[PDB]
Amino acid sequence: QKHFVLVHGGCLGAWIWYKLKPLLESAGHKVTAVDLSAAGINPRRLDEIHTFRDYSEPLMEVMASIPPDEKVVLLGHSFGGMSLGLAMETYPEKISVAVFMSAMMPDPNHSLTYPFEKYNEKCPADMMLDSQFSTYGNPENPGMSMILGPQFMALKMFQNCSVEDLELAKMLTRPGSLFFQDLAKAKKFSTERYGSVKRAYIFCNEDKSFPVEFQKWFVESVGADKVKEIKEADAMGMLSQPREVCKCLLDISD
Numbered sequence: 448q449k450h451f452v453l454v455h456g457g458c459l460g461a462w463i464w465y466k467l468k469p470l471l472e473s474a475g476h477k478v479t480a481v482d483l484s485a486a487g488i489n490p491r492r493l494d495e496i497h498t499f500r501d502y503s504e505p506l507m508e509v510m511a512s513i514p515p516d517e518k519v520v521l522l523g524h525s526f527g528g529m530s531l532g533l534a535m536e537t538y539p540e541k542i543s544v545a546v547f548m549s550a551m552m553p554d555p556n557h558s559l560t561y562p563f564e565k566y567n568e569k570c571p572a573d574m575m576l577d578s579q580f581s582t583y584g585n586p587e588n589p590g591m592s593m594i595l596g597p598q599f600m601a602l603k604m605f606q607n608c609s610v611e612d613l614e615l616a617k618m619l620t621r622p623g624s625l626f627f628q629d630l631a632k633a634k635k636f637s638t639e640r641y642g643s644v645k646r647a648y649i650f651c652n653e654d655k656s657f658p659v660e661f662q663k664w665f666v667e668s669v670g671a672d673k674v675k676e677i678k679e680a681d682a683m684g685m686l687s688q689p690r691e692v693c694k695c696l697l698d699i700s701d
């Protein structure tokens with residue numbers, strides 16, 4: 448038995464893991480799927496969350512409650528990788544392996560905004576399609592909020608998923624933030640902390656929102672201890688290939 452803590456990306460929520468949580472449990476493991484602040488059915492509203500630590504606070508509540516005797520495996524995807532990073536900085540010893548599936552993997556050597564800068568470098572400005580962006584917070588120093596466009600979701604996140612999974616996410620997706628202006632002010636991670644945590648990576652070769660060539664770039668520039676691939680996972684591998692993410696994760700963790 449291991450304890451997996453599962454962390455969703457932006458605009459999503461704990462619900463994305465609904466297909467993978469049973470699977471890990473039927474193999475005999477403990478699973479936690481967290482909702483981050485203003486995501487899923489978390490009661491907070493976006494415009495009351497201005498920092499990324501505030502956003503990541505329900506993950507941090509989980510990590511503080513890992514008994515002294517225990518460790519967890521973390522799985523994050525997309526923007527979830529950033530929360531994995533804070534978890535890994537603050538509680539390095541409570542994590543046996545941090546697993547990043549088609550996620551940005553922070554590097555103690557750069558500002559926390561660096562994977563975002565590199566994404567703008569490597570991807571076109573129209574990458575998010577019908578998604579839409581607006582400022583919130585103080586007009587004097589603003590946040591950016593985003594909503595996922597229906598086409599963006601169908602073509603570029605859930606394209607190897609059932610229309611059912613696509614429909615559920617339209618019902619459940621909420622405005623998100625990538626916290627860029629706050630992340631630009633956050634303390635960097637260190638190698639003594641963040642950097643002491645074994646890391647794994649799971650490629651999702653068919654992720655059109657985060658192309659594999661760019662996922663491959665985080666492993667080449669930061670490194671990972673283990674690395675797997677899902678030939679047919681899209682951005683939502685946990686929904687499109689839930690049995691393969693399970694298999695990868697038991698491999699990585701055993």
Ligand SMILES: C/C=C1/CN2[C@H]3C[C@@H]1[C@H](C=O)[C@@H]2Cc1c3[nH]c2ccccc12
Nearest residue numbers: 456457458525526551562563566656657
């Ligand atoms: C919530 C929709 C998004 C679209 N896109 C955006 C933001 C999110 C999503 C992950 O949740 C991916 C992957 C990603 C994005 N920006 C990145 C920067 C560095 C590495 C990966 C990314």
